[PDB]
Design a protein around this ligand. Sequence first.
Ligand SMILES: [Mg+2]
Ligand SMILES: [Mg+2]
Ligand SMILES: [Mg+2]
Ligand SMILES: [Mg+2]
Ligand SMILES: [Mg+2]
Ligand SMILES: [Mg+2]
Ligand SMILES: [Mg+2]
Ligand SMILES: [Mg+2]
Ligand SMILES: [Mg+2]
Ligand SMILES: [Zn+2]
Lengths: 135, 94, 134, 176, 136, 38
Amino acid sequence: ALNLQDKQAIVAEVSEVAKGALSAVVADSRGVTVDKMTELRKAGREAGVYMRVVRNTLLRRAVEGTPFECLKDAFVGPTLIAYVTEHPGAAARLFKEFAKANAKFEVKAAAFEGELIPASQIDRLATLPTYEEAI
Amino acid sequence: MFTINAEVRKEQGKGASRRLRAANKFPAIIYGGKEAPLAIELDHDKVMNMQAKAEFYSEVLTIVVDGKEIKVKAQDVQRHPYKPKLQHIDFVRA
Amino acid sequence: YVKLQVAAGMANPSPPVGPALGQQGVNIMEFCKAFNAKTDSIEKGLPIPVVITVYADRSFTFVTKTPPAAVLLKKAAGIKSGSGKPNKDKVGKISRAQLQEIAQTKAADMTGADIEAMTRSIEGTARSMGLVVE
Amino acid sequence: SRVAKAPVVVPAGVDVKINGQVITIKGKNGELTRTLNDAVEVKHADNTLTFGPRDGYADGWAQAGTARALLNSMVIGVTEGFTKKLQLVGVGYRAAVKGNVINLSLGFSHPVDHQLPAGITAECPTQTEIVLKGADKQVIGQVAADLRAYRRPEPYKGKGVRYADEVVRTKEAKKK
Amino acid sequence: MLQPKRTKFRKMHKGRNRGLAQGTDVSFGSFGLKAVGRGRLTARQIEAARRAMTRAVKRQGKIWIRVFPDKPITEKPLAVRMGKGKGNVEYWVALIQPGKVLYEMDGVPEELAREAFKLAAAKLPIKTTFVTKTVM
Amino acid sequence: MKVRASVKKLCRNCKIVKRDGVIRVICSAEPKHKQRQG
RNA sequence: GAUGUCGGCUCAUCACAUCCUGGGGCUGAAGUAGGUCCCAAGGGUAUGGCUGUUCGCCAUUUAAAGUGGUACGCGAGCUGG
RNA sequence: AGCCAGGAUGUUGGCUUAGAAGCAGCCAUCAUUUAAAGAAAGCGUAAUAGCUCACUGGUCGAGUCGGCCUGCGCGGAAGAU
Ligand SMILES: [Mg+2]
Ligand SMILES: [Mg+2]
Ligand SMILES: [Mg+2]
Ligand SMILES: [Mg+2]
Ligand SMILES: [Mg+2]
Ligand SMILES: [Mg+2]
Ligand SMILES: [Mg+2]
Ligand SMILES: [Mg+2]
Ligand SMILES: [Mg+2]
Ligand SMILES: [Zn+2]
């Protein structure tokens, strides 16, 4: 089991990678094999995306430090968080095509700008190109 | 710091010590220095849990006997022959 | 659907793949030559793993995988048969430069992200077969 | 106690009559009645049913737990309804319903005629399936078990009257 | 099977097993098996117990037998009338008073020390408690 | 049915249940594990 | 200042630690047949060869040929090997 | 406690064997992707598969776990009018 010493450390690591990171992607990960997971881990690390499954009781504490403090109501049910540290967007697209291919889960909500994104309008961070497109 | 609350013994000898033990309490002696030895009664439950910690035998402990506080060290424990209980303790005035 | 390990230029004998693959519903002649026609580039004397994806119409589709981790540590150290008692009996020796050789080839199958992550997953396959890192 | 504290929710068009210990629960799917143990005090109020221990009775909470449990399934009974399914395994085994009688072919001299009690009704979708429908959980259980008893699933082939959900672990016969 | 090599006398007067034990503490090992009851331990018993616990610890660690069967026990056979001398010595015992440490064992985890002592305890005529070493 | 003075849980699926004063071991996985104290 | 001994015969009576028949759990129980245990005392439970023998060996039956108590039941009932 | 989900990759670890692919035996028991998954606690397969556990994320919503000293009980517990 997770002791508070181990509990705090988790809160800290997520709270820290929250500050620097640009776009975070909250989603469901129930009823999917490890073979499919370990695969979206290779697609994540490549696209500069940070992947984690953390306790909703710990994620509500680790996001309290702002700007993602509108994802509270997004920590109900299984949760997977995709912090995009290098270039904003990368996960919100990596998920959008992983969802359509595997048919399981829904992807809870997206976060950016310190403003809320509902389950209906996740096509916003999914239609953005590169950085690296303005030249 | 181990704080042991105690009382000076009103009776002494076999009879008294047995009666004491029955009443879930146990006799103990405080000796050392110029000061005459002190016959004390201790609670069997509270001290037994204390002595479970190894530190009980290394550290200096305070034995509260009627307001007064006596700094002593664990000198010699007399244990129950087969039960996990304590029969008597020698406290050397430190 | 079954997992097997057939040679770089050999695919036909009866004792290894014979009544093990032909019992499901796979052609003993259509697979035997289609497998050796694509594994011709793969070096002689190196076992190569292959997985079969069979459907309800006896048809088949295979994607070949890189040689095993307990397979490439025998040709790099100079041993035909391993140690019966691993870490109790030493059969050979392999340098830090030979560990990355086996790792750069296994890059298509390995779970690791870094070279050091793929090197440590070959370090483990070496200790559990008697071989010592020197 | 955790069972007794959890309340039973009486739905709409479900009448609850409580005469001291005697409870009567009427509905669409029928009517059930029960005599609650003296150690149980039941309270009606609102669209709910609550159970608690009666003063002086030691087994109070233990009794209250069972009381709740029962009434909960009575409520389910006279609304939703219980449905037990049984499948006949093995050569020659057949079954058909003749009103309130399940006629059973189970490899005996005589075919078995099993009279059905009140509120339990049977139908045979196949010659190899018996479906029981009713309001009393204790009774629908009783009847299912009685029919199963005619030929308990044998451990060598799985042959006999088995429950739909039943997982009949089979074993190999002695070697030589 | 424990027994005195030589003795000053052949046979011994019956005596009594009154009083409490001496040797009430784990003085060599990390764990001990202490008598709660009062009785006689025969060498064949002591061995049966020793054997079972030695098997348990997979002969790893150390074991000490705190007791020794030094009392000779005599017996009269069938169709032998009373008197006509003291019966012949047949076996040897150890008089056990409550509190005797019987065995001590160390160099094994407490879990294993408790199990090894559980098995040995089974081949014994008197009730036993598991004990651990102490500081005074 | 093993009738003995010492009735014990023989596996994880074994369960000690007291029926009419008779300490019993009832098991869901092993039938050989079925016991009654007597 | 006498409580007649083994075995048989005749006649028994109880216990159950059950031989058969009855109910049942496990089985290294397919069936048939066994093995083991639990319940159970209602009734039933060979005839011969050999030996004073009980016992035992053997022959041939039987669903079975139970184990014990009863002054090693039973001589003011018989026998007397 | 229950209920939903997952319990992966190197890899079928090495040796052995007609086969040993966690699961006849023997020796070792690291490392990777990790929320977590033993180079595997049990059933199964000729060997595979398949089923489930250790472990972990979700749900739930307030208690839960098993040692210590002790009082009184239960089983262990079959006999002959
Ligand atoms: Mg006196
Ligand atoms: Mg009963
Ligand atoms: Mg006279
Ligand atoms: Mg009986
Ligand atoms: Mg037996
Ligand atoms: Mg009879
Ligand atoms: Mg016969
Ligand atoms: Mg007589
Ligand atoms: Mg006469
Ligand atoms: Zn069991």
